[PDB]
Amino acid sequence: GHISGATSVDQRSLINSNVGFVTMILQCSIEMPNISYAWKELKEQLGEEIDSKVKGMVFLKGKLGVCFDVPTASVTEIQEKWHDSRRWQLSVATE
């Protein structure tokens, strides 16, 4: 077991990345010919009232994923309010 990698060797201000927004990463084992594929899965597990609370979701490479930005407060909501699934997995940004 190991989990690290949340820091750099550079800083500008006394909140370089600490709070604001953080991107998340979506993985599927199906082609997403539309973006609704991802949204419906989140809306199944976070409850349907999630679409006031995201920014411009964009398509990952392969077309077998998407990514989007949420506020850091809600970044920490989602991964407690998610259970990894039989095809869908969720990931979070490094910064």
- Say if CB 75 and CB 20 are below 8 A apart: no
Q: Does domain 18-95 have CATH number 3.30.70.2280?
A: yes
What ranges do the domains of the chain cover?
18-95
Euclidean distance between CA atoms 4 and 77, whole angstroms: 20
* Residue in this structure with the two tokens 């699934």, named with its chain if needed: 85
Segment 63-66 long-range contacts (CB within 8 Å, at least 24 positions apart): 63/31, 63/32, 63/33, 64/27, 64/28, 64/29, 64/30, 64/31, 64/32, 65/25, 65/26, 65/27, 65/28, 65/32, 66/26, 66/32, 66/35, 66/38
Q: Which technique?
A: NMR
